[PDB]
Amino acid sequence: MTIGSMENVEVFTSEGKGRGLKATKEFWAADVIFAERAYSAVVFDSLINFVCHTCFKRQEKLHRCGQCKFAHYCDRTCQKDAWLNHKNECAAIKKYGKVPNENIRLAARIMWRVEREGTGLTEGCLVSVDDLQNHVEHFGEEEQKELRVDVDTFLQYWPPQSQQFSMQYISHIFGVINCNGFTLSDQRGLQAVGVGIFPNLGLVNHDCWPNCTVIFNNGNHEAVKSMFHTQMRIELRALGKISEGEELTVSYIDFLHLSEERRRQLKKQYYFDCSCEHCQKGLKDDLFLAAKEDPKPSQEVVKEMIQFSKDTLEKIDKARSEGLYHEVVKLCRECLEKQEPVFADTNLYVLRLLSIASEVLSYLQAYEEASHYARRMVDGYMKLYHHNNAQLGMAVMRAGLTNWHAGHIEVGHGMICKAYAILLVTHGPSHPITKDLEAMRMQTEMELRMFRQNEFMYHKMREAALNN
Numbered sequence: 001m002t003i004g005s006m007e008n009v010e011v012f013t014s015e016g017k018g019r020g021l022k023a024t025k026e027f028w029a030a031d032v033i034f035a036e037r038a039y040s041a042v043v044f045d046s047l048i049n050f051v052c053h054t055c056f057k058r059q060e061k062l063h064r065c066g067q068c069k070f071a072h073y074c075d076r077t078c079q080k081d082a083w084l085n086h087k088n089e090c091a092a093i094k095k096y097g098k099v100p101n102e103n104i105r106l107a108a109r110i111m112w113r114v115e116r117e118g119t120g121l122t123e124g125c126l127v128s129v130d131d132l133q134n135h136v137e138h139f140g141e142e143e144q145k146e147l148r149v150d151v152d153t154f155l156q157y158w159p160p161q162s163q164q165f166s167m168q169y170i171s172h173i174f175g176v177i178n179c180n181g182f183t184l185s186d187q188r189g190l191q192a193v194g195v196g197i198f199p200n201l202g203l204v205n206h207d208c209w210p211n212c213t214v215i216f217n218n219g220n221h222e223a224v225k226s227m228f229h230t231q232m233r234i235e236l237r238a239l240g241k242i243s244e245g246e247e248l249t250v251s252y253i254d255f256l257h258l259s260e261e262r263r264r265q266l267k268k269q270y271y272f273d274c275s276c277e278h279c280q281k282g283l284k285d286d287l288f289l290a291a292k293e294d295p296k297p298s299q300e301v302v303k304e305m306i307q308f309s310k311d312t313l314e315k316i317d318k319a320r321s322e323g324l325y326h327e328v329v330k331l332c333r334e335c336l337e338k339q340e341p342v343f344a345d346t347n348l349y350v351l352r353l354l355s356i357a358s359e360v361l362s363y364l365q366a367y368e369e370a371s372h373y374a375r376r377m378v379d380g381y382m383k384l385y386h387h388n389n390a391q392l393g394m395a396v397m398r399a400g401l402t403n404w405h406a407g408h409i410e411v412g413h414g415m416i417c418k419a420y421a422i423l424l425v426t427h428g429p430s431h432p433i434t435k436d437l438e439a440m441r442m443q444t445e446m447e448l449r450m451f452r453q454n455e456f457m458y459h460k461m462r463e464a465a466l467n468n
C-alpha cells in the first residue's frame with residue numbers, strides 16, 4: 001500500500017496508557033502494518049561532515065553545500081531533495097554564523113514545516129506534530145534548565161521573517177522532541193547518526209515482548225523514480241500473527257535486562273510503570289540469572305560471582321574506552337573462566353562477556369577464538385529473545401560472519417541463513433542490511449558447495465581405490 005496511509009490502524013484510548021493503536025485487520029509476521037516518512041529529521045552534531053543530511057548514509061566522499069559549509073550530501077541528487085527543508089536553515093545558519101544544537105535544528109525544521117503547511121497535522125495523520133505526548137511537567141531540574149537554554153539559543157537562531165511561535169509552543173516542541181525522537185542509523189545499522197520525528201509511530205505504546213518491530217530504511221536512488229520500497233521511511237512490521245482489534249506495540253528498550261531493570265529504564269526515560277506480562281510475572285528472570293545445576297552453586301557463591309562480574313565489566317569498559325583491547329580480552333577470558341562453574345549460558349553476565357569478547361577478538365582478527373564465544377552467545381540469545389527479534393537477527397548475522405572468517409563454513413552459512421530469515425521479517429527484502437546479508441548468503445552457499453564437493457570427491461576416490 002502507500003507510505004503515509006494509516007488504513008490498517010486506528011487510534012483508541014487505553015486504560016492508563018493514554019492513546020494507542022489497534023489493527024483494523026489481521027496481520028502476519030513480516031507484514032508492513034504501515035510506513036511513514038520523517039516529519040523532520042537532522043544529523044547528530046558529532047556526525048555533521050560524515051553523514052548525508054538528506055539520507056543519513058555514511059560515505060567516504062560527501063559534497064558540502066557551498067553556501068553554509070554545514071549540510072553534506074551523497075549527490076547533487078540528495079542535495080536537491082533536501083533543498084525544501086534546507087533552504088531556510090541554510091540561510092538561517094549563515095545569519096547565525098554558528099551551528100545550533102541538534103535539538104535546536106530539529107525544533108526549527110518542525111516549526112518551518114508547520115509554517116509552510118500552516119498546520120501541524122500531516123495528510124496521513126492520526127496526530128499533528130504538536131499533539132504528540134510531552135512529559136515536560138516531569139522533567140528533572142537539569143532537564144528543565146537544559147530546555148531553557150535551548151529555547152534561548154532557538155530565539156537567536158530563528159529568522160525574524162519567519163512565523164513567530166509563542167514561547168509556550170516552542171518549549172512544547174522541545175518537550176515533544178525529548179519524548180518522541182526516533183534514532184536514525186547509517187545504511188549498515190552500525191551507528192546512530194540522527195534523530196527524526198515520526199508522528200504516527202508516536203502513537204504506539206510499549207511492551208517488553210511486543211508484537212511489532214520498527215525499522216528505518218535509508219532508501220536508495222538509482223534510476224526508476226517514485227517506488228515504495230526505495231523511499232526513505234520507517235516501517236512498523238508484524239513479528240507474528242496479530243488479530244483484528246489487537247493493540248499494536250513495540251519495545252522502547254532492549255529486552256536483555258531483568259524486569260526490575262527494564263521498569264527502571266522505562267520509568268526514567270518514559271515516565272511510566274510497565275505492566276506487560278513479562279514485567280508483572282518476571283518472565284525469563286530465572287534464565288537471566290541462571291546458575292548451574294550439575295553441582296548447584298550456593299546462594300553465596302552466586303552473589304560473589306555477580307558482584308565480581310559487575311566489577312569486571314566496568315573495568316572492561318574503562319580499558320575498552322582507552323583502546324586497550326588485549327587487556328579487554330584478558331579480562332573477558334578470566335571472568336568467563338570463573339563464571340563457568342556458577343552461571344549458565346543464558347545468564348546476562350555471561351552473555352555480556354561473550355558479546356564483548358567476540359567483538360574485540362573479531363576486531364583483532366583472531367577469528368578462531370571469536371567464533372567460539374560467538375556461537376555460545378547465539379545459543380544463549382536463542383533462549384531469551386523472541387525468535388523474530390531484530391537484535392537477535394543482527395547478532396546472529398555477526399556471529400555468522402566471524403565463523404565464516406575463521407573458516408567454519410558449515411556453521412557460518414547456517415547462522416547467516418538463520419539471520420537472513422529473521423531480517424526478512426524485521427527489515428524486509430529491500431532494506432540495505434538485508435541486501436548485504438543476501439549477498440553474504442550467496443557467497444557462503446558457493447563456498448559451502450565447494451566444501452561439500454571436495455568431500456564427495458574424496459569419497460569417489462576411496463570408491464575407485466576399492467572398486468566399490
Ligand SMILES: Nc1ncnc2c1ncn2[C@@H]1O[C@H](C[C@@H](N)CC[C@H](N)C(=O)O)[C@@H](O)[C@H]1O
Nearest residue numbers: 016017018019020133202203204205206270272
Ligand atoms: N505500556 C505503557 N504503559 C503506560 N504508559 C505507556 C506505555 N507505553 C507508552 N506509554 C506512554 O506513552 C508515551 C509515549 C507515546 N509515544 C505513545 C502513545 C501515547 N500513549 C499517546 O497518547 O500519544 C510514554 O511516554 C508513556 O507516557
Ligand SMILES: [Zn+2]
Nearest residue numbers: 052055074078
Ligand atoms: Zn543521501
Ligand SMILES: [Zn+2]
Nearest residue numbers: 065067068090
Ligand atoms: Zn547550506
Ligand SMILES: [Zn+2]
Nearest residue numbers: 208274276279
Ligand atoms: Zn514490561
